[PDB]
Amino acid sequence: AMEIVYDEADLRRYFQTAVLLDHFLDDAVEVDVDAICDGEMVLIGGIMEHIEQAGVHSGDSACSLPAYTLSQEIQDVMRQQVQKLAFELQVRGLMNVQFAVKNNEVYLIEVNPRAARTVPFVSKATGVPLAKVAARVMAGKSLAEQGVTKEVIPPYYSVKEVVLPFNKFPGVDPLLGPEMRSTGEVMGVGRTFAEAFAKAQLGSNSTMKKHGRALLSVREGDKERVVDLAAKLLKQGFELDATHGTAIVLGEAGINPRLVNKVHEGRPHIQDRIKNGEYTYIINTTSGRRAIEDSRVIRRSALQYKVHYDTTLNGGFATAMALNADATEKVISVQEMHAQIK
Amino acid sequence: AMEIVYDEADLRRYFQTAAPVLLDHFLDDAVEVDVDAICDGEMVLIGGIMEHIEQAGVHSGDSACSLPAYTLSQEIQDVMRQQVQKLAFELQVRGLMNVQFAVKNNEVYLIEVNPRAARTVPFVSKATGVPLAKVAARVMAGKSLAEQGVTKEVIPPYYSVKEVVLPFNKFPGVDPLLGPEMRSTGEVMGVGRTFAEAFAKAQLGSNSTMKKHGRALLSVREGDKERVVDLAAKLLKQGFELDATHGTAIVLGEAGINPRLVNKVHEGRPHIQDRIKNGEYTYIINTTSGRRAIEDSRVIRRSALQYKVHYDTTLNGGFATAMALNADATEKVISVQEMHAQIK
Ligand SMILES: Nc1ncnc2c1ncn2[C@@H]1O[C@H](COP(=O)(O)OP(=O)(O)O)[C@@H](O)[C@H]1O
Ligand SMILES: Nc1ncnc2c1ncn2[C@@H]1O[C@H](COP(=O)(O)OP(=O)(O)O)[C@@H](O)[C@H]1O
Ligand SMILES: NC(=O)CC[C@H](N)C(=O)O
Ligand SMILES: NC(=O)CC[C@H](N)C(=O)O
Ligand SMILES: NCCC[C@H](N)C(=O)O
Ligand SMILES: NCCC[C@H](N)C(=O)O
Ligand SMILES: [Cl-]
Ligand SMILES: [Cl-]
Ligand SMILES: [Cl-]
Ligand SMILES: [K+]
Ligand SMILES: [K+]
Ligand SMILES: [K+]
Ligand SMILES: [Mn+2]
Ligand SMILES: [Mn+2]
Ligand SMILES: [Mn+2]
Ligand SMILES: [Mn+2]
């Protein structure tokens, strides 16, 4: 039962309703690294950059392999940091390490000295059967011995996206957080991150379209960044609707969305519009226990009415890119993927 | 000291803050009309029919008006005419009289009859070329309209529009807003070949700072919400960029117009006030209804006045303002002599 408390007043609130205390790394890029250690060397299985930031459980995050935004430099740091930890803990077989990158700085989230849920993904993207190799390693065959020494960076992009069970429990707020709730995953393969992301998205049963009206209702910390997102969408032919505060900031950057009322504001409001099919896409980011609680209708509504929605700006940007891709254009077999590897 | 109460809750509100009290039904969304005439007991001469720009509810003394009428139908004017004639005799008018009417849903309501010379007489004299005070003085003294040879109503070939000037800038603590009470100190006159030109001249004469470019702030009430769309449309066609407050922006977006959203003061920064003060606006159309809303919207009008931005507090006025945008007050001048010479 992990929560993110914003302030002091916010803690009692928890405390009461409600121990490990940790500083939340806000606006950070979460990373998952899968590796093998035989006591002799460390094999980097895959470095995966999640789309959703730290604070959204890795299990519920879409992710990319290779990393789509992280610097070689930043990643080399991680690589070294994992090797250091492999030896230190005396890993023999599989291991997974979770990082957060904030302001060009690498921080340690956790070390899982065992097989992690991303293994099959990495194995498929990299064509290397990590569970088999690590098994052998555990049984006594060194990496050296196996001819498995080099880290594989495929020529193509591999993206993993999850599927969430919210539709099965309507009374639940379909919102991402530090706790994992997904049931499954899909893989998208493309020549570009945008292609891979498009394939992941469509495979995950997303109802996203390449036309219509998008609803933008983001929080403070996203208002600035949301400008670029609106630009993108307008550029893809989307019309824009926005809730008061968000419209304000857009307006201040030269973008004039059509305003929509919050439910308490009047009619029609967001719910009538969602219900009435005015939107093909919704971006709704929130912060604060309170805020979340009051915005619940947007998310429940979008779910109920099958409108594609993103609860993170990063997801938004990923979706925006995918719009320039065509998930049906080309196909490729796993064998083909694998042969293409140096 | 009178106002328009909108409901029971409001009546208390008032009745408290304030002796038999008069209670009249307020004809909302009505066109106010002024009619000046002369009766000699044998006949009735119509001096002029003026159509106010601001609706009934904005005192006639403070309304802009036009001679001849700019929206009313002849049919409706003919009623007013018969009505004036009937009143004239019944009342035994001998000399000048003035009749004020409200038109709503194609129906003519009587607001008041003033059986003496009215403040609009000079304007009508000047527009029609007929010196009403002289004519009526001769009538009171014994010379009939027939004896005088002044028996037929004169409809000029040009439009004449009267605009007023208000003293709000002399008393900054007052809310420079129109209502049932007259607060104006003077009037101007504008003459044109079209109502738009007459209006532009009257507007310019009245010391208006209106411009034909920039950004306009739109913040109107409920009853105006639907109709303000076409005005924002006229404003965009003229080249202006629009700003709007919450609910106004909502109505407009649904009509396809997307103004830039601005925050009220309680709402956030920068707000309407900050914007006005920084010279962001060149035009402001701001309509309100009910004691509270009025009280609450105060800052817009005071700021507008303070910062010299032209502002309209009525939609009818806003529309007048927009039409004038299509006219050039400085393009042509005409002398009164010439004007009267045109008279047929
Ligand atoms: N200090 C932190 N700052 C930001 N996000 C964090 C932090 N600690 C954990 N998280 C988020 O919570 C998720 C779960 O954290 P983790 O420690 O790995 O728990 P679990 O045992 O469920 O794996 C992480 O994947 C990340 O999204
Ligand atoms: N029943 C009414 N409906 C609408 N407006 C009215 C009504 N009665 C008065 N008014 C408005 O108030 C103004 C002042 O009212 P009026 O009766 O003419 O008083 P005054 O003697 O001060 O001129 C009118 O010019 C008109 O705009
Ligand atoms: N950032 C948000 O989701 C805003 C809150 C929400 N729209 C409400 O009605 O309270
Ligand atoms: N019609 C209006 O002017 C609405 C009221 C005003 N904007 C306020 O700040 O309350
Ligand atoms: N990877 C999580 C699912 C994404 C979902 N559309 C959301 O942003 O909430
Ligand atoms: N005719 C009265 C003056 C109009 C002023 N601009 C206002 O509309 O408040
Ligand atoms: Cl795991
Ligand atoms: Cl008078
Ligand atoms: Cl004062
Ligand atoms: K994450
Ligand atoms: K009037
Ligand atoms: K009277
Ligand atoms: Mn974890
Ligand atoms: Mn764990
Ligand atoms: Mn009167
Ligand atoms: Mn009177």
UniProtKB/Swiss-Prot annotation, chain B:
Q: Where is the MGS-like domain?
A: 208-344
Chain positions recorded as Mn(2+) 3 binding sites? Q100, E112
Query: What positions does the entry give for Mg(2+) 3 binding?
Result: Q100, E112
Q: Where does ATP 2 bind?
A: H25, L27, E32, G57, V58, H59, S60, Q100, E112
Q: Where is the ATP-grasp domain?
A: 1-141
Please report which protein family the annotation says this sequence is part of.
Belongs to the CarB family.
Give the quaternary structure. Answer: Composed of two chains; the small (or glutamine) chain promotes the hydrolysis of glutamine to ammonia, which is used by the large (or ammonia) chain to synthesize carbamoyl phosphate. Tetramer of heterodimers (alpha,beta)4.
What is the protein name stated in its UniProt record? Answer: Carbamoyl phosphate synthase large chain
Q: Which organism is it from?
A: Escherichia coli (strain K12)
Gene encoding this chain?
Answer: carB
Full protein: residues contained: 724 to 1073 of 1073
